[PDB]
Design a protein around this ligand. Structure first.
Ligand SMILES: *[C@@H]1O[C@H](CO)[C@@H](O[C@@H]2O[C@H](CO)[C@@H](O)[C@H](O)[C@H]2NC(C)=O)[C@H](O)[C@H]1NC(C)=O
Ligand SMILES: *[C@@H]1O[C@H](CO)[C@@H](O[C@@H]2O[C@H](CO)[C@@H](O)[C@H](O)[C@H]2NC(C)=O)[C@H](O)[C@H]1NC(C)=O
Ligand SMILES: *[C@@H]1O[C@H](CO)[C@@H](O[C@@H]2O[C@H](CO)[C@@H](O)[C@H](O)[C@H]2NC(C)=O)[C@H](O)[C@H]1NC(C)=O
Ligand SMILES: *[C@@H]1O[C@H](CO)[C@@H](O[C@@H]2O[C@H](CO)[C@@H](O)[C@H](O)[C@H]2NC(C)=O)[C@H](O)[C@H]1NC(C)=O
Ligand code: GDP
Ligand code: GDP
Ligand code: GDP
Ligand code: PLM
Ligand code: PLM
Ligand code: PLM
Ligand code: PLM
Ligand code: PLM
Ligand code: PLM
Ligand code: PLM
Ligand code: PLM
Ligand code: PLM
Ligand code: ZN
Ligand code: ZN
Ligand code: ZN
Ligand code: ZN
Ligand code: ZN
Ligand code: ZN
Lengths: 560, 560, 560
């Protein structure tokens, strides 16, 4: 099985070099196109780079103040700075108040609730008892009675008087909260690639303001500009708050030869503009300060509407990795065989006879493509599975050879039908040298009944031709090639120069060589010479020229 | 090197088309299986799609209130709404209080600390001085004395009296914080694919509540159902707080023909249930309000235990990309050669004689697989490296040819052993035409010593056979083929019809052609005809028939 | 086109098995190298694993207190615990105060601002009116007058007196905030792989402190160590706050046979150390408590500088996926043909005559590589596109055959130049058997003008040799092979043994067979035997031996 010489074996694929401009041109342009697409994808998607998602940290600083005068009994003149509207978070998100309601005497008692649009209840003692409403903050025993002038509400155990249920003002308060300035210091890192960077670099202008075209890299933003860049109106969002999103996209190429790693800023409204009224439309929150005055545990509650800005820092950093390039090249290497596949398809399609039957006469421009057929004769070598039932029979009348692959079921082989096969080119180089008692299944006269078992007798039942005429044995070459004793002796000497030469039982080898000679004569290819069935007239002629004394003649046997 | 015709060269692969049902069947079923697996992986993992992680923004709204009566000197009836237990964050995380302790007279002085289970210290002045305990909030000078009835503690500089060290109540306060409702508005975006969507869509029911089977898409959640869906008990988590996680998974397919992009909700307890007592088991925090009463800078501190719900939004959006499909197809194209590899392995395995020696007689079912061997004869063409030491020698007695690859170290070539090589099929188509003073290393009588340098004399030392007998020169074909002057003249005319024909020094070409004729006679293949070593008898017979007048006979020379 | 037998066809690639140690060695070592690199990349990058990013939840607990004495009119002694400096967030980020300024009587009035380094304004009424400064919290009408001793500031409507503009103390307050301890409980999950784990496991030491080498897996951290591990100074960061980042990297392998999933802790300063003074250098925030005293709505504001620690949890979990392994193997399978490509390149390079002209004589070590040329003769079979203009002509004088691919534009074919082609090896096995009125373009004497249309007359204008001499027709083999009637009759009988044999119009077949015989004689390969152009002398000799009675002689016709 395994030998030391077997290890050092190597197999080269046999090929034939076709000299043609069409095949070479389509080959080269297909190779160039697939190479161009591969390189384009490589340099566009940067598939040679291992990517990694960043890790981000954000620091927000909101600077700006707003004057606002309370509603006139007594009038107030107040100022709002970052200490009040801004929250202690100050990282990755920040709140900018744009409207506020306040209740000073918030304390626990059994007063009613504010009448909303639908909450206006005129019935007396109709409300549920111990309902624990999510709308009104207190658990209620109904006892509905009027505290307003022309309306009423249920008796609630919430913080009183008249805290919830009130709508926001219109126009919005704190309209000066649009020129406020946000400084966003963002620091991103790629730990696998080990590259840390940040938004602000040395030399950046401090007094800049972000704009889409003039100074995009400036990390200083104005809220009005944020809302105007996407067409949003700051006033309606100031009446009822919202949720904005500052997208910071990093597309970082950490390669030194093309190093670029900077952010791109975008803005997107996060809260649903057209949202249901039952759901909480805007972003709001209600917080209070607790205190004890006159012995009563009480508090003061303010509900603030404003815009929450989510700073969404995302991106990807790519760095050259050899393994990714290797995998991509290994994937794309298979496409270079597209040219060979297409050309082989062309050759196999134009080699068929259907192109000569229908295509070439009708089209009349694919006529020179018949050349492809010749390439098929140089590309393919059709063989057949040497089955035991495989047989080959020839007839002088017809030009082709019949492949009788079917099995014998007692019927005479002369009438069995098979697939025609064209005879080979005969290798013209090697060829260029100097009474009526028949079995009734032959058309000639020289046939003879076969002497074999009846189960296997139909194999020898073959004739030299399909219709009556001259027998092939009467030809001039049959006497000279098939059973010319000098010729067979010369052939055997060529195979074994020291043969017995009329010794003991030499006629068997001469008979076998005569069978092989007739086979190679009619069936040129050695694949077809084997598994050939000679006719009875020639078989028994050869047997007469080289009889067997003390034994029967064994017919065709499976060689392999 | 390079020519314009060399660019237009295309090389096809020579093949032989086997007609067999077994090979074709296994080829087609293997191709179908690999194609089916490739398509299955492509459609399941969606490898034709470029994926992208989402960017999310969450907005939480907790609605629900809870009545609770303080411990009875005086009794207090209180209500808790979203203003108190909920925090100002309101995005991506929210706290829901489920237990609380409070201390009103929190002020700075040198009073003792609360006695815990292990913190109970009965020693007198045994505690460390200036220890700065992390457990107790104050730095301690020991001075341990009793302030309780039957227990004592060290003197601490913490906010007093007796704030820390106290356990939580059991049962939990604010047990009504289980029917509380959470509205989670989640807006997600794929910026690379440029697709923004949100949890709540138009037409969704407002009064719905989340359930695993009935209404999963409802973003309204009940706190009790969240714990009950995973078997968690809300009471024990209400006594000592915890951390829950609302996982929102997006598996978005942005292709129009199969567009689906909606969330899936799941719940998972984040804090370790079985955790150490030394570590802080539950989620809690202690915050206060600062105030000045009677001139003393003081505060009131409350420690709240509750459940922190982390809304973990994650997922992936896939969109059709051509480069990913190209890479995947290029990767999977190599698997289509699996059928060819397997069939070639089958052919190369069943071609060896090992299968005929052991496998076929024993098994008796692999008998028809010997046909594969024939395919090997049509697939492979074994050749040998034409080394300078490569030689071929034949013997009329033995049927095979010996490959003497070994080098001559002075030993006679007649006894050198080599690897047997079977003679070819002889190309039957082209063949079907019409006293005792020996060197003592030969076995015939016609041998003669070689006239060459002693260093290179052993090459010609070869005989026509291994054992005594008739010499090959006495054969009938030797006189007709090898040195028949008419035959060699005809061959030379076939190569060059205008030869000198008995002119000056024609015997050299006749001698060379006679050597080639004997080689092709014994060593059929031209690869074996070259590098063949003739015996001394035939060599000197040919030299006698075609002598060299005024020069020595140059032996075998490396042609390449 | 399509047949049931055509489906079961399978094609094996023809190969020739080379027996050489060099080729086998380079093949095997190249295969081993590419296999080793593939396995190394697979086991290093874990490309057989599908990766997934984690989802994290962090819970922070800061323990530690700090004593601090206020500046001495009256002196104060106070303690700071986690209730005050820590924020209610307690998840994924926490604040640790390291400096504080405070203003008690913060209230709204028209007092001036604190004079900074540049804010010191000496002009009288020079400041802008209604400027709404971001620097000072109040909107200002100028009215600049002095309130300090030797300096002045504009009149501001901010919360007064002298809140903003003040620098931080140096040394920093709360220097005891360096031994503070942080417990970080991090729970991570891989939902696609469905694997949940956490930082703390059973059996971990509770009293441990994090160290790089001794106990890295301890999740308890000291704030001083976090700065000392990276060389940062805690005092300068305590004076003016900063931002730190605790990186928690997960490299989880969820395969059971190599299961390891634990965090790695690193620390990185997030805020820019060397940052502009105009920008806010350190991390700080100003918050207040609101109250009413003496009827005035007032507040007390404290500005805190401290370190914000961002717990950046990230990582990746890999789990065995068959599809990823299949894709990777399909990608890397193409590299196994690298050995075949390299060996074919070697064979095609060392097969050219360029290596024998320049390389082998000069180098003298690549001499035995000429053997590769022989492999080319066994690998490649160069053919030519059978164009209509393709022609072949031979001459007895010259040894090679001329390929006349050019078209006939009326010029005589005898003088047309073409590319030389070497004659084949002649298949020595098959060959080893037993007056002055010329056209003036030939050089022999037996030429004759051609009888064809003038447009196609130049095709037959060919001679048997390039220079004068003996005509090829006078050769001895011409009379025996080309026009020996017995030979042609035997050949035709071999093709069809039942020919008419001197019947009606048999001379046409004999003439065609004589043309084919001369072609196969001079042009051995059947590819070159076709498309051959015989000379006028031999052509008209053959026509004289086999005349045509009642018709003209049709010249060479395109067979395909
Ligand atoms: C926000 O800022 C803009 C720009 O400073 C204000 O628009 C100016 O308002 C002042 C008020 O006296 C006037 O000078 C002009 O009406 C505006 N100036 C310019 C150059 O247009 C705006 O009033 C501010 N407040 C908001 C929008 O609420
Ligand atoms: C943005 O919306 C605001 C209102 O929220 C618009 O300002 C109002 O315009 C109407 C027009 O009829 C006036 O009646 C109101 O008095 C205005 N109010 C305020 C506060 O300005 C404003 O015009 C809108 N801007 C754009 C660009 O559409
Ligand atoms: C939370 O809500 C549920 C459902 O409304 C309450 O369960 C009911 O409690 C009241 C108590 O008087 C009674 O109607 C029944 O005992 C319960 N009915 C049902 C259908 O469950 C629950 O008591 C509320 N409070 C909690 C859980 O603390
Ligand atoms: C933080 O803790 C360290 C270690 O406990 C303190 O360092 C010690 O300080 C005390 C001061 O009386 C003395 O024991 C030594 O000066 C120090 N000993 C060691 C071993 O370092 C430090 O003073 C504490 N406070 C800070 C850093 O502000
Ligand atoms: N292709 C072919 N080979 C045959 C045929 N007949 C016999 N052979 C071979 O010739 C041998 C049998 O010849 P035969 O003289 O009839 O019987 P034998 O005397 O017992 O050897 C066997 O080796 C067969 O393989 C035939 O008809 N066609
Ligand atoms: N295969 C083979 N070729 C041989 C042998 N001897 C000679 N040749 C060839 O014949 C030529 C030498 O023949 P020879 O008459 O002995 O010497 P020469 O007169 O100098 O040419 C050389 O071209 C050899 O290649 C042999 O024994 N075996
Ligand atoms: N290769 C080659 N084939 C030729 C040549 N001349 C004729 N043939 C073939 O021989 C046939 C024409 O021979 P010819 O006797 O001259 O004319 P015909 O009487 O009409 O057959 C055609 O089938 C040609 O293909 C030639 O010069 N070279
Ligand atoms: C005589 O030679 C005995 C029979 C030897 C048959 C050897 C069969 C080799 C089979 C190789 C199978 C390779 C499978 C590789 C899977 C990864
Ligand atoms: C003889 O060949 C007649 C049939 C001609 C039509 C078939 C030729 C096909 C050659 C091109 C095939 C590659 C293109 C595939 C299109 C996607
Ligand atoms: C007679 O033989 C009629 C002509 C038949 C020509 C058949 C051409 C087949 C073309 C196959 C093209 C395959 C394209 C596959 C693209 C995915
Ligand atoms: C028949 O089936 C063959 C069809 C192949 C046609 C291919 C045509 C493309 C090549 C154009 C001609 C050669 C151009 C040479 C200049 C580069
Ligand atoms: C005579 O022909 C001179 C010798 C010419 C030898 C040409 C050798 C070509 C080598 C090609 C190497 C290609 C390497 C590609 C690497 C990407
Ligand atoms: C003659 O061939 C005797 C040996 C027979 C055993 C070897 C045949 C192997 C054919 C199948 C190989 C592919 C299957 C590989 C299994 C993973
Ligand atoms: C010898 O060793 C060959 C072994 C290969 C056997 C393969 C058997 C599979 C094919 C089954 C027979 C053909 C079925 C035809 C109907 C589709
Ligand atoms: C005849 O062959 C003379 C030219 C010799 C030089 C070319 C030989 C090249 C063989 C190696 C090619 C593969 C190496 C590729 C380098 C990247
Ligand atoms: C000429 O062009 C051929 C050059 C190829 C040289 C390759 C040399 C590598 C093999 C070393 C020799 C064989 C070693 C055998 C022991 C394993
Ligand atoms: Zn008959
Ligand atoms: Zn007959
Ligand atoms: Zn001898
Ligand atoms: Zn001898
Ligand atoms: Zn002439
Ligand atoms: Zn001539």
């Amino acid at each position: 099985c395994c030998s030391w010489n077997d290890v050092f074996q190597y197999e080269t694929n046999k090929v034939t070099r076709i000299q043609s401009v069409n095949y070479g041109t389509i080959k080269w342009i297909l190779h160039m196109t697939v190479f161009s697409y591969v390189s384009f994808a490589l340099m566009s998607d940067k598939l040679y780079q291992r990517k990694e998602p960043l890790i981000s940290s954000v620091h927000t600083k909101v600077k700006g103040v707003a004057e606002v005068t309370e509603n006139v009994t007594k009038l107030v003149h107040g100022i709002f700075d970052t200490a009040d509207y801004t929250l202690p978070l100050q990282g990755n998100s920040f709140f900018v108040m744009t409207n506020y309601l306040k209740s000073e005497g918030q304390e626990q008692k059994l007063c009613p609730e504010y009448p909303s649009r639908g909450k206006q209840c005129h019935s007396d003692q109709g409300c549920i008892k111990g309902w624990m409403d999510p709308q009104s903050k207190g658990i209620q025993t109904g006892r509905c009675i009027p505290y307003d002038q022309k309306r009423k509400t249920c008796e609630i155990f919430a913080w009183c008087p008249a805290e919830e249920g009130k709508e926001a003002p219109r126009p919005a308060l704190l309209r000066s909260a649009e020129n406020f300035t946000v400084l966003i210091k963002n620091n991103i890192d790629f730990p696998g690639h080990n590259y840390t960077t940040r938004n602000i670099l040395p030399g950046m202008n401090i007094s800049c303001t972000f704009h889409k075209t003039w100074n995009p890299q400036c990390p200083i933003f104005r809220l009005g500009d944020i809302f105007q860049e996407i067409g949003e109106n700051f006033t309606e969002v100031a009446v009822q708050g919202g949720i904005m999103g500052i997208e910071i996209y990093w597309d970082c190429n950490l390669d030194s030869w093309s190093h670029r790693c900077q952010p791109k800023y975008s803005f997107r409204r996060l809260d649903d503009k057209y949202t249901n009224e039952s759901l909480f439309p805007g972003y709001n929150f209600r917080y209070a300060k607790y205190y004890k005055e006159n012995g009563m545990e009480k508090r003061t509650l303010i509900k603030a509407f404003g815009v929450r800005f989510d700073i969404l820092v995302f991106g990807t950093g790519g760095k050259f990795d050899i393994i990714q390039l290797v995998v991509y090249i290994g994937s794309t290497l298979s496409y270079f065989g597209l040219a060979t596949v297409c050309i082989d398809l062309i050759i196999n399609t134009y080699a068929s006879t259907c192109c000569r039957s229908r295509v070439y006469p009708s089209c009349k421009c694919c006529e020179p493509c018949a050349v492809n057929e010749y390439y098929y004769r140089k590309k393919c070598e059709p063989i057949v599975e040497p089955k035991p039932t495989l047989k080959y029979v020839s007839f002088v009348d017809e030009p082709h050879i019949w492949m009788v692959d079917q099995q014998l079921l007692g019927k005479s082989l002369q009438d069995v039908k098979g697939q025609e096969v064209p005879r080979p080119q005969t290798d013209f180089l090697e060829l260029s040298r100097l009474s009526r008692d028949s079995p009734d299944w032959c058309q000639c006269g020289n046939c003879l009944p076969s002497q074999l078992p009846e189960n296997r007798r139909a194999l020898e039942e073959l004739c030299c031709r399909r219709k009556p005429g001259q027998c092939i044995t009467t030809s001039e070459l049959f006497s000279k090639i098939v059973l010319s004793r000098e010729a067979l002796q010369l052939l055997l000497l060529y195979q074994e120069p020291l043969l017995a030469l009329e010794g003991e039982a030499i006629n068997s080898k001469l008979r076998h060589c005569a069978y092989r000679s007739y086979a190679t004569w009619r069936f040129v290819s050695q694949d077809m010479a084997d598994f050939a069935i000679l006719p009875s007239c020639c078989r028994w002629k050869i047997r007469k020229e080289f009889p067997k004394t003390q034994g029967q003649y064994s017919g065709f046997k499976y060689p392999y």
